[PDB]
Amino acid sequence: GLVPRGSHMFIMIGERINGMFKDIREAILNKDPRPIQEWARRQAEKGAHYLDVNTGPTADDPVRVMEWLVKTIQEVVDLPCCLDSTNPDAIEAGLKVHRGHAMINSTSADQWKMDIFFPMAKKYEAAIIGLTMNEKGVPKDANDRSQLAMELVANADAHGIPMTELYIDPLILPVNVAQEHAVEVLETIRQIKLMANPAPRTVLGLSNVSQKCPDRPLINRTYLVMAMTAGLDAAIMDVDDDALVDAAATAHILLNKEIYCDSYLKTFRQK
Amino acid sequence: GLVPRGSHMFIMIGERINGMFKDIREAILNKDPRPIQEWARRQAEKGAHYLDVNTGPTADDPVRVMEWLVKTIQEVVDLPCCLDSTNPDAIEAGLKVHRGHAMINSTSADQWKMDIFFPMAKKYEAAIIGLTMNEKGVPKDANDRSQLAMELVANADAHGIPMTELYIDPLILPVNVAQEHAVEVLETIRQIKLMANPAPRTVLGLSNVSQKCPDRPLINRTYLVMAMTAGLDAAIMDVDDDALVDAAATAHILLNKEIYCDSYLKTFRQK
Ligand SMILES: CN1c2c(nc(N)[nH]c2=O)NC[C@@H]1CNc1ccc(C(=O)N[C@@H](CCC(=O)O)C(=O)O)cc1
Numbered sequence: 001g002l003v004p005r006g007s008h009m010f011i012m013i014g015e016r017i018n019g020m021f022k023d024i025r026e027a028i029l030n031k032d033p034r035p036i037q038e039w040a041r042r043q044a045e046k047g048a049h050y051l052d053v054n055t056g057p058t059a060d061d062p063v064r065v066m067e068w069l070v071k072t073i074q075e076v077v078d079l080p081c082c083l084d085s086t087n088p089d090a091i092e093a094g095l096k097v098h099r100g101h102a103m104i105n106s107t108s109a110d111q112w113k114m115d116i117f118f119p120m121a122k123k124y125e126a127a128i129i130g131l132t133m134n135e136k137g138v139p140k141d142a143n144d145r146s147q148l149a150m151e152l153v154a155n156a157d158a159h160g161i162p163m164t165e166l167y168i169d170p171l172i173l174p175v176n177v178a179q180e181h182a183v184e185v186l187e188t189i190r191q192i193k194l195m196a197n198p199a200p201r202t203v204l205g206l207s208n209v210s211q212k213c214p215d216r217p218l219i220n221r222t223y224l225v226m227a228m229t230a231g232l233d234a235a236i237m238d239v240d241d242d243a244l245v246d247a248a249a250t251a252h253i254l255l256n257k258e259i260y261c262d263s264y265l266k267t268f269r270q271k
Numbered sequence: 272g273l274v275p276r277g278s279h280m281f282i283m284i285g286e287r288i289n290g291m292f293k294d295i296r297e298a299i300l301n302k303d304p305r306p307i308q309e310w311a312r313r314q315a316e317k318g319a320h321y322l323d324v325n326t327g328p329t330a331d332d333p334v335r336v337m338e339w340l341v342k343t344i345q346e347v348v349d350l351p352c353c354l355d356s357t358n359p360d361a362i363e364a365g366l367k368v369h370r371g372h373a374m375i376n377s378t379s380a381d382q383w384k385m386d387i388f389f390p391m392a393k394k395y396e397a398a399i400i401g402l403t404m405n406e407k408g409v410p411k412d413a414n415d416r417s418q419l420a421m422e423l424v425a426n427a428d429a430h431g432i433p434m435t436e437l438y439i440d441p442l443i444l445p446v447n448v449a450q451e452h453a454v455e456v457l458e459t460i461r462q463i464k465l466m467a468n469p470a471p472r473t474v475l476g477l478s479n480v481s482q483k484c485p486d487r488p489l490i491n492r493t494y495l496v497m498a499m500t501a502g503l504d505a506a507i508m509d510v511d512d513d514a515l516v517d518a519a520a521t522a523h524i525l526l527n528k529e530i531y532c533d534s535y536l537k538t539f540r541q542k
Pocket residue numbers: 015016018020021022084105106129169171172204205206207208211212236
């Protein structure tokens with residue numbers, strides 16, 4: 001049921017160095033390491049366990065862009081990177097220059113993607129996010145999402161990837177246009193936690209639940225709490241949002257995964 | 272699983288007219304209807320579906336106190352009362368003067384209490400809260416709480432009480448002294464929702480999760496969201512806390528129990 005079997009700390013993956021944001025896009029254009037390194041530091045300070053790294057749209061060679069991002073981040077910060085790209089060569093390139101164990105974001109449930117990405121994760125000893133979806137699209141029901149989760153689990157195992165290295169992403173969509181999905185995603189999280197011992201982990205790009213909605217911060221933090229209750233292990237999230245991190249810390253306590261103390265908000269942040 | 276079978280609006284029971292609070296205690300002493308009527312109005316305005324009514328400690332006759340509270344409330348407000356007392360004569364007295372259908376708070380799983388209170392609820396057509404506990408104390412595990420829930424369900428049914436009239440209370444305790452209970456309560460909520468068709472409802476005195484803890488509002492609203500995810504139907508709560516009601520409204524939307532709109536915070540409040 002909802003009593004968590006594990007005590008593992010919740011994994012916060014800072015979402016902010018992503019070329020979708022103008023300041024990151026322009027730093028990449030100008031090859032200016034300053035905005036990159038500032039955001040790496042700010043997120044580290046706020047307590048991120050990993051830093052997401054996404055080139056964004058570029059006409060530049062994604063391989064060079066990724067190597068660059070990864071090295072300039074890890075120069076000023078000791079944190080592993082969550083390498084976020086649809087380009088396997090870009091991912092492998094970041095992995096070759098990465099210090100420590102990385103996370104790969106992501107592979108789909110498409111067979112040819114699994115076939116490429118899983119070997120990469122084993123070879124480099126990286127964690128890997130599988131998304132529940134394939135070229136037929138992202139499913140609606142929890143039952144259809146769970147079916148793709150099982151397929152991801154099977155392939156991961158067959159490539160010799162430990163379940164503690166595998167993070168399944170149910171794909172949260174915005175509540176305004178997508179509303180009915182948010183509860184199906186919650187149930188999928190619950191089901192994934194059942195699929196093996198030890199169980200696969202679970203992750204969400206969290207901010208997607210609110211994209212283009214009126215009070216983003218309130219919706220984001222409400223849903224993170226719901227997802228954590230359902231069994232969520234990790235989120236790509238804005239770690240710069242103090243209210244959001246406050247909510248996660250409070251939920252982690254109420255879940256009995258860390259011993260309560262009056263200082264728990266501060267303690268949660270230092271891990 | 273976590274996809275709710277029903278669309279019912281979340282039931283907010285205003286906690287504030289309770290003799291534990293000095294201003295209420297003194298209004299009762301002086302027989303001053305003003306503070307009572309102000310709090311009835313404020314809570315109604317904030318969107319409460321019921322108003323909790325608790326005499327608090329008194330050397331006065333609880334029967335007279337209760338009749339008085341109930342009449343002075345319902346004079347200025349059209350809302351039903353949730354009659355909160357350990358004294359069955361006080362409860363029956365409020366029920367005789369009550370306009371509309373009341374709620375009784377509460378009976379324990381003690382046989383002699385069930386034997387007294389259930390007939391009262393059927394006779395007066397009142398909803399009734401059962402608490403999961405008896406003279407052996409409040410159980411620790413969800414499994415032990417659920418066992419008392421089943422016993423409450425059985426007695427309610429045997430008295431001809433519909434499950435839609437029955438609200439089972441798992442008994443939340445403060446996270447500072449009680450921390451391990453909060454997750455057991457969540458699992459109990461989940462289990463209760465399984466025990467019949469239609470299912471019994473569930474309720475928490477919510478503010479108990481934070482009593483004598485440092486940031487009460489944050490802990491209260493985090494846990495309400497978790498409990499709603501688990502299937503919570505109703506809470507005795509501070510409806511005057513706008514952040515708390517904002518959180519519940521957001522969770523209700525994310526649960527798909529009401530159709531999303533940009534105005535949903537306001538819409539949730541008008542029911
Ligand atoms: C698809 N999301 C996602 C993922 N990875 C996984 N595994 N799952 C996911 O759902 N990586 C990318 C993204 C998560 N990251 C983000 C990052 C930013 C914003 C965001 O809110 N963008 C701002 C940009 C502001 C600007 O352009 O200046 C926005 O308001 O749109 C959302 C999600």
